[PDB]
From Swiss-Prot, chains A, C, D, E, F, G, H:
GO molecular function: endopeptidase activity; threonine-type endopeptidase activity
Gene of this entry: psmA
Record protein name field: Proteasome subunit alpha
Modification after translation: The N-terminus is blocked.
Regulation of protein activity: The formation of the proteasomal ATPase PAN-20S proteasome complex, via the docking of the C-termini of PAN into the intersubunit pockets in the alpha-rings, triggers opening of the gate for substrate entry. Interconversion between the open-gate and close-gate conformations leads to a dynamic regulation of the 20S proteasome proteolysis activity.
From Swiss-Prot, chains B, I:
Pfam families: Proteasome
Outcome recorded upon mutating residue 1 to S: No effect on catalytic activity
GO MF annotation list: endopeptidase activity; threonine-type endopeptidase activity
InterPro entries: Ntn_hydrolases_N, Pept_T1A_Psome_bsu_arc, Pept_T1A_subB, Proteasome_bsu_CS, Proteasome_sua/b, Proteasome_suB-type
Cellular location(s): Cytoplasm
Biological processes, Gene Ontology terms: proteasomal protein catabolic process
Class of enzymatic activity (EC top level): hydrolase
E.C. designation(s): 3.4.25.1
Protein name: Proteasome subunit beta
Chief location bin: cytoplasm
Catalytic activity as recorded in UniProt: Cleavage of peptide bonds with very broad specificity
Top-level taxon of origin: Archaea
Gene Ontology CC annotations of this record: cytoplasm; proteasome core complex, beta-subunit complex
Length: 227, 202, 227, 227, 227, 227, 227, 227, 202
């Protein structure tokens, strides 16, 4: 509808938000990633894309920590992603200051979606062109969430993000199993990733980051990734 | 209250007592006044409890943020400077506290900080009503050439003396040790009781 | 009217608000649900739609509590629904703080509609794309309300929401009875729901939540739902 | 004028406000009602329209009280009507607080029209799509007013509102009489209402609410309405 | 100029303000009225138009008092007229409070035009669709003014307003005389009014209000009007 | 340029401001006037246009005083002229309060142009449709200025304004002489005015106002004007 | 690009700002001027254009002083030029107050460009239609700058401005010499000016203003200009 | 997309920001420059373009210092570049004041990108038409960054900027080596620059600025540049 | 506290002690009160430590900014003026300090500055509780014709006297020398101890 795809604050006669459905198209341009729970833990993986040797390999990593017990990874407009992650790293500290300890994760993911939905109902501002993944350990246990540009929240046992998203959930919806060991689940993940991959491409030292109860996150090096 | 922090060749040592006093009597015996705010950094507090607990929460946040964004720990001179500004900014509606900051970067460092923002680096310092009884022990027995085991026994001989002469100081002694190798380490209570009997202070 | 369907703050020559009639089209896209009163109580039901096994079944539930004596369920833009429910959970506490006890429900539903009508008469902001149901017990007794995107309030003995709305009220306007027992009314409700359902589909462990005077809400498990 | 019917703050070359004449078209969509003075009193009536049995009959009533000596009824966008009535119920208390007693009614009706005209000369906001009736007793005696979307005030001995408005004033302008008894005037009112009614329809337990000096309002039940 | 008749804040290539010339077209739709000075006094008259018997004859009067020594009458959008008169009734009290006595009238008329010109040079607000007449006694003596929608002020020995404006000034510019008695001037006024009147119509108990030095205003009843 | 003649804040590809060149067209619609210096003094004249006998001849005068040693006259939108003159009458008092005495005139004319240029570089507001003349005596001596709608200031030995502007400066640029007597310069002025006049018209008791060092302004009556 | 030449805050597909390139067209309409350094000094010159004898020759001068050791001259919209010069005369005093002495010039020119660039990245305001020249003596020595409408700063040994700009820099780029005497450089300047001049025109008592270390500015009279 | 290339706050149906892709076209118009790390140091180079001899060679230098241990160089709209560099020179001092010492560089580059992304998600303001390079020494060691108009940050071992950007990274991606001596790396840099250069042009005394641990920056003169 | 700054033909000399006093006793012995805020400029402080450390950070920034934008150092009269305004602006919520500013531009200059903003240029000045014991030495031994080596020995003879009579002054002496040739130079501690023994003050 060329007449109803100019402003975020306009519904179409069919009751839609094209400027909102469009922002979801900028996400599918980003790299691929996912997350899976298992026995007393949870993890993440990203579709590391090779780049020029001239770039420091310690900043290309999309796996970002929000605290020693929470992490995240993002897809879409990199300029906005860098912002929300900083917004998350700040909301988390507000809780620790207010409650003495990041007692729950949903108290965090919520502060974000509220910041994103805000840019959807007011004019003169565009939404955020990114969706994210959140993972970590709380009083409850292993968690795993996702957030679309408008603020839609949903808690999953597993999920993907990027371009090969639908291709992964397909594979993963069939072969996923609960309460698995660590490496037993990783080899499963790289596979579902390997699925969405085009035949012409392979896997190029992807990022991984796991965690387990009573512990902290562990970014193990590309060496162990080969395995 | 009685806090103490010293400096050696490749280590830092901090210690306190635990007694707290509210309503002009001994309301709590196992309080807490020594905190780990970073991987190689610690802090003590003396004065109004509320104003101090607040800060400890602010600092733990500012330093965990930095460590995640920049991927390394803030130096110690900067930690003290950050506070100095956060206090001078409200020197007319101020926090009524006295602080010590100690940690490791390329070398050991200890800083004393007042309510108005004054920060000074020193090889050893102490805060609280029992501070002077400690300065008297250090002026007489401190030596930069000492080891860690010797420095632990010293801070114990010092606070054990303030407890004998300051009424607002008392309780079991909490001790911490900091090194680039093992990091921040809070000593078990049994090791303290052991050294005490070994020295004759009970 | 392509000339009068761009802004909320413009009446058509016939005296209408197309941008307002459009928001009512985004609601009919949401799942179906209803609510019924009976003997000393009231309840709710939602058209639970099966999803991937990968989603935690403790967040798909649309039945949301506002207090131990009030609940609600919503249809439409999920991003906005999550917001009003939080707005309701906050307005309710303002009363308890101001009056010591949520003495009435209409004092609550009103604070909401006022927030929604606000986004209908001012430019630069779009309305909310949701209608809701409210239920609970007050000093009076069992209550049951509904709210459209503009703030229209109406108290019912029964009501539906979603896509099969008109299909339900039809069935329900014929077979509804007052002061019924609990389960006697449930079997009636699932039926009116079963009516609006397309023949190709059935019922998939719907959500239910009832309550009775002197008690609190009860979310009984899918086990009892089969019955 | 397709070129001058987009904004409230634009006069046509003939000196008009189409966006204002349009809001008067949304009022004629509402139910019908009227008001009549008589001997030491005044009253109101509404064209009660039958609805589903599923709606509580204690909220369909359009006859709303502003104080024990003032009432009102409205026609048009129900979402906005609910707002002004609350605005009126608040303006009335401001007087009682300021002067110790709602000494006059025009001091109230004025505070409203001022709120409505406000939304007519500024851009970015639409007017209110409603006109109202006000009645009650003051130091002077029986009063009766009306307010259009722009703030036009006029005091009448009788008036109507809704869709059958012109049809009523016609009938009523011919057969109205002053200083009549109570029921003698009611039977006259239902008649003028009966006039504007389409032949296919009849009267369905309309709302009535009268009052008399030294007394308070009286909402007598449908039982007496049959008579 | 269809390209330069949309906003008040746009000059045409010929240096004009069509949105301002348009507001002057809404005034000519209002009733007719005038004002004349004479020996130690001044007066006003309005073209009272018959209405339904159902309207109280104590509110149809357009002759409005601003103080016991100043009055006014208005033509155009009735919704805005009701506002400025209240604005005038407030500006007058500001002087009495500031200077102890409404010492001059021009100090008042000025506060108004300043409020009207304000709505002519800023966007997002429409002008006022009314012109007014002011009359009264000050330290100087009998005065008489007029104000157009933009703030143009001019002091006259006589003036008219409404639809038959030009028709009156024509008649009146020929037969007007200074320092006349009271009734001798009234019979002259009704005549100039009678002139602009269409042959099919006559005079229907017009409003009159005079005043004389050392006295206050006098609204004499329709009885004396017949004479 | 129909594409660049809508907003003040838009330059044309040739570097122009049509909305600014247009405001200069509304000035040429106003009456004519001028000002001339001479021996130890300066004066003004206006093209008094006859009007209806019904208007008080003490308000038609365009010659306005700002202080007993400064005056002015204006051409263009009369509604705006009345405003700046009040703005000038206020700026002048700010100096007397700040410096104890209006020591200079340029300190005044500047405060105005700054108020006018302000309405040229910001959107949502139209410029002023007037240019003015200023005259008076300061510590320096006789002065004479002019101000266009944008704030352009220029000090002259003589100048004109209105419709016959160019016609006057032409005549006056040829026959003007410095350090002349009073009446010797007046007869020169009326002549240059007589020049720009159309043959069908003559001079109708124009306004004049002169001044001389150590004195105050003098508005001499039409009687002496005949001479 | 008729589609990208309406607003300052819009880049063209080629990465340009037409509304910015346009403002540079209003400058080329202004008179011509330049500035040259030399031995222990610097100077300025302006293309004085003859005007009517009726204008005081003490205000036509475009050479304006900012302080006894800094001057400037401007080209373009005269209404805006008068403003920045006042803005400069104020920024200079802020330094003297803050640092006790205008120690540097770049600390001044910078405060201006910052005020001009401000009106280039925000909507609802047009840029300034002028470029300027600055000259004077500081702790360093002779300086000479220029500023375009956007804030571009550049320090020169010589520069021109106005309409004959390119014609001058051409001539001047060939025959300019450093560390010259005073008059030896002036005769060079008038020549480069004489170059850009059209054959039909000559030089009409241009403005000049020089300065030398340990001294102040010197505006020598037209008498010496002939030489 | 002529329909989606007008505002920054509008996504295209494909999920893009043309107004953002356009700003990247204004950068490619600027001069060329790069930066390279090496053994215990890092450096910069700029494609110095010859200009008129009339410009002081101490302001043409694009190599700008932010502190004695950090520098930068920019490409694009020179008016905006001058601003961010001042913004950077201020953010750096905020750290020194807050933390006593510019302990890290990323704490600085971040404060900038946040200022640039700000002008990308809000309407009424255009982005910045520049990308930059940052270099310097911190607690970590030699660093090197880059920033696009939206805030995208990336840390490199080498990078280029300007028009010959892609041409350089090509050359440089092949022949770059780590931990090289100083001059050994310079001769490599000028070469990659020499590559992107058009055959018709050569190198014209380019700017260079290096640094080494425990030291400060060194802007060595054109003399050594020849070598 | 005790600070001193003098002026010679082509040089400037500034000196302080190091003792600090918090909580009404000697808490630190090797404090710092003499700072380099510019290439040819220095400053001393006396009074509330926090309020002073803050300023030193503001000034170091304003002067390093100027130097980078304008490419040259700010004069000294302007530095003092900048402060004078930054203090008078808060004369009712003020900084409780006394300052000295010294540097080189075309000539040497020394300025004294109070809490309210008063700035005065002089050939020599002193701040702190030990100031008067210094003015007594300078009034008797100062001479514009002196060299640098003679001026260094003088400021030492002066502060060494205040330490003998002011209880709030003590510690090792920090000395700085400023010249257009060698710039700001902080003297090594060994050179100080040497001159002291050479003079007989230990």
């Amino acid at each position: 509808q060329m007449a109803y795809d100019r402003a975020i604050t306009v519904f179409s006669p069919d009751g839609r938000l094209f400027q909102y459905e469009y922002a979801r198209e900028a996400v599918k341009k980003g790299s691929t990633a996912l997350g899976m729970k298992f026995a007393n833990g949870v993890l993440l993986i990203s579709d590391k894309k090779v780049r020029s040797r001239l770039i420091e390999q310690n900043s290309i990593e999309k796996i970002q920590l929000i605290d020693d017990y929470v992490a995240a990874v993002t897809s879409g407009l990199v300029a906005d992603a860098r912002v929300l992650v900083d917004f998350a790293r700040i909301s988390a500290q507000q809780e620790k200051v207010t409650y003495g300890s990041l007692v729950n994760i949903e108290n965090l993911v919520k502060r974000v979606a509220d910041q994103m939905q805000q840019y959807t109902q007011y004019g003169g501002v565009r939404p955020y062109g990114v969706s994210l993944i959140f993972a970590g350990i709380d009083q409850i246990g292993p968690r795993l969430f996702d957030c679309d540009p408008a603020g839609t929240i949903n808690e999953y046992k597993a999920t993907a993000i990027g371009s090969g998203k639908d291709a992964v959930v397909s594979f993963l919806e069939r072969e996923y199993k609960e309460n698995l060991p660590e490496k037993e689940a990783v080899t499963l993940g790289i596979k579902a990733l390997k699925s969405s991959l085009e035949e012409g491409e392979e896997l190029k030292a992807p990022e991984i980051a796991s965690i387990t109860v009573g512990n902290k996150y562990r970014i193990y090096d590309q060496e162990e990734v080969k395995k | 209250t009685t806090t103490v922090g010293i400096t050696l060749k490749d280590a830092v040592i901090m210690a306190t007592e635990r007694r707290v006093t509210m309503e002009n009597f001994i309301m709590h015996k196992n309080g807490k006044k020594l905190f780990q705010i970073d991987t190689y950094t610690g802090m003590t507090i003396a004065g109004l409890v509320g104003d101090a607990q607040v800060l400890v929460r602010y600092m733990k946040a500012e330093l965990e943020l930095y460590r995640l964004q920049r991927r390394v720990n803030m130096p110690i001179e900067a930690v003290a400077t950050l506070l100095s500004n956060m206090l001078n900014q409200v020197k007319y509606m101020p926090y009524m506290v006295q602080l010590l900051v100690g940690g490791i970067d390329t070398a050991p460092h200890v800083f004393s900080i007042d309510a108005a923002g004054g920060s000074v680096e020193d090889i050893y310092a102490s805060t609280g009503s029992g501070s002077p009884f400690v300065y008297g022990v250090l002026e007489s027995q401190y030596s930069e050439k000492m080891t860690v085991d010797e420095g632990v026994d010293l801070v114990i001989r010092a606070i054990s003396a303030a407890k004998q002469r300051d009424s607002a100081s008392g309780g079991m002694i909490d001790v911490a040790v900091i090194t680039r190798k093992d990091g921040y380490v809070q000593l078990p209570t049994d090791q303290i009781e052991s050294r005490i009997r070994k020295l004759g202070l009970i």
